[PDB]
């Protein structure tokens, strides 16, 4: 009867500790003891990490509001040290269920090697990589229980900082319309070999192409050779993960020159690719012919 008494008081002080957690009132009523322990331990670890920073304002809350992705800091062992609340908006899983667990239990298997090489033309500590994370979201909300969770491609960018942490902002690649359209972008559709099957009419204003002439042509013929490798890698990602974001690259205009571009590509359903290209520049070197088609059109 003394063993019980002690265990009952253990559960009581553990529930009191759950009441000390930095969450709204009543949330602790939905937690189990293991989750209480995990969240308290991770809270103390994150406080130790934030205390090591060498530095109250009402404009602070703007920062997470201005971001589109979510905050994630991972330890050197791969455990999710911290996630911001808006993670629920991107993966369905909340920070309550994810803080204190290992990232590898929520990453696609074939991405674990990439992440492991990230946790150990680019500044030495800066990190850019795509990661498939478990998400329970559909267009109707959080409708998937964890075992039918789908893979969501996240463009992760951040820094190795110093224990050593990897601090990332992780952003979702939106899935791709009707006039009137905006400026600084156009849309294209390709087969999996990246041959044009459709292209926005705005291309005529952007690069001077009529969309009908692009139909059937390989997209790789329209990139600057200097951007060869990078675009290749992007497409490889697009082919293995389902979505990708390219770097800045030069797209060749019809009669000469090029313009700076960055595109988001998504595989859709037998399968095809949709590209949303955001323009960075207007046509540069307009009087310079670079490709054979460019000099065939300059005449």
């Amino acid at each position: 009867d003394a063993a019980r008494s002690r265990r009952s008081q253990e559960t009581e002080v553990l529930y009191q500790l759950a009441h000390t957690l930095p969450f709204a009132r009543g949330v602790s009523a939905h937690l189990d003891k293991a989750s209480i322990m995990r969240l308290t331990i991770s809270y103390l670890r994150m406080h130790r990490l934030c205390a090591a920073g060498e530095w109250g304002e009402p404009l602070d809350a703007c920062y997470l509001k201005a971001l589109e992705g979510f905050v994630m800091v991972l330890t050197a062992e791969g455990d999710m040290a911290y996630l911001s609340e808006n993670v629920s908006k991107h993966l369905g899983l909340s920070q309550l269920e994810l803080i204190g667990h290992s990232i590898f239990d929520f990453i696609h298997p074939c991405d674990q090697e990439e992440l492991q090489d990230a946790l150990t033309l680019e500044a030495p500590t800066e990190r850019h990589f795509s990661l498939r994370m478990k998400s329970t979201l559909t267009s109707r909300g959080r409708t998937l229980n964890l075992k039918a969770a789908t893979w969501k491609v996240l463009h992760c960018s951040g820094h190795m900082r110093a224990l050593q942490c990897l601090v990332l902002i992780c952003e979702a690649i939106p899935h791709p319309l009707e006039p009137p359209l905006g400026r600084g972008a156009f849309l294209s559709r390709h087969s999996l070999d990246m041959k044009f099957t459709y292209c926005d009419e705005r291309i005529a204003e952007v690069a001077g192409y009529s969309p009908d002439d692009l139909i059937g042509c390989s997209a790789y013929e329209y990139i600057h050779a200097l951007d060869s490798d990078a675009v290749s890698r992007s497409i490889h990602t697009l082919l293995s993960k389902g979505q990708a974001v390219t770097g800045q690259y030069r797209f060749l205009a019809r009669t000469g020159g090029y313009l700076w571009t960055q595109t988001q590509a998504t595989v859709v359903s037998s399968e095809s690719i949709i590209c949303v290209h955001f323009l960075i520049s207007r046509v540069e070197e307009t009087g310079v012919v670079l490709s054979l088609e460019q000099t065939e059109q300059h005449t």
């Binding site: 002690r6 500790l17 850019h128 600084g184």
Partner: protein, 280 residues
């Protein structure tokens, strides 16, 4: 459930090492009072610093109607090499590339999308310049907020550099040493960059449509052919060859061409051969 009791042991030991100031429930008691020694998981200030540790960016707030800068954070100085002197008192259009003004104005329009609506765009902004301004690509994400005339709408945004990998000649800072070309499998020039003009004396259009063999010394032509056939039978691995190239003027030049086939990432068909042609 033997696992369940054993993870709870480990946890109590982790919290043991976490609380600075025993038996498990004594651990829990002192951890309760320690937690009460210190509602969100992190403070807004902490999260701000975390975000600034992740992104190379700065927060700005500008009026939607005129672009007038109403706030910029001090991290604009390390990011853009720009004093806050340059932003406060100006408009965002003063900072961006002229070619971006229209786009900016459209992003700042709240006609169809207003309070709480999101914005995401790319522009080029002025950085610190010693002697003609120099622009850098900035990715901006933010939201529309009524700013307390009446309460005018404002864009509250973060602008970041280096969201992806950055996108040449690097051994001679003055005159180009090489140029890149592309060829069909037949060897015809289908792409050349303008450095050709400085390296071999030809305008790009003087090479496009012609075969690379047409510029190779006859005594070296068979060697060049062999090397190209070999690179076609390899799949992406680079192979080098050295041969005498005929200049538009100024005689024969020793030239190192290192080539590899571009494989379609899906169909694995040859898109073209890529060549780096370097004057030896």
């Amino acid at each position: 459930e033997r696992r369940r009791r054993n993870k709870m042991t480990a946890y109590i030991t982790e919290l043991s090492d976490m609380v600075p100031t025993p038996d498990k429930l004594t651990i829990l008691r002192m951890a309760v009072s320690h937690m009460k020694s210190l509602p969100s998981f992190l403070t807004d200030q902490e999260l701000k610093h975390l975000i600034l540790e992740a992104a190379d960016g700065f927060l700005f707030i500008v009026s939607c109607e005129t672009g007038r800068v109403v706030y910029v954070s001090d991290s604009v100085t390390p990011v853009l090499n720009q004093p806050q002197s340059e932003w406060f008192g100006s408009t965002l259009y003063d900072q961006v590339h002229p070619d971006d003004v229209d786009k900016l104005r459209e992003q700042l329009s709240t006609s169809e999308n207003a309070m709480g609506s999101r914005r995401s765009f790319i522009c080029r902004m002025r950085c610190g310049t010693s002697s003609e301004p120099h622009f850098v690509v900035v990715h901006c994400t933010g939201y529309i907020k009524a700013w307390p005339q009446g309460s005018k709408f404002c864009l509250v945004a973060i602008g970041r550099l280096q969201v992806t990998s950055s996108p040449t000649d690097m051994s001679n800072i003055c005159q180009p040493t090489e140029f890149i070309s592309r060829h069909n499998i037949e060897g015809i020039f289908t792409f050349v960059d303008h450095r050709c003009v400085a390296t071999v004396g030809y305008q790009p259009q003087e090479l496009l449509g012609k075969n690379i063999v047409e510029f190779c010394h006859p005594e070296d032509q068979q060697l060049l052919r062999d090397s190209f056939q070999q690179v076609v039978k390899l799949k992406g691995q680079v192979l080098s060859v050295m041969f005498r190239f005929r200049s538009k003027t100024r005689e024969w030049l020793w030239m190192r061409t290192s080539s590899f086939t571009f494989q379609n990432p899906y169909s694995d068909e040859i898109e073209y051969i890529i060549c780096t042609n370097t004057n030896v």
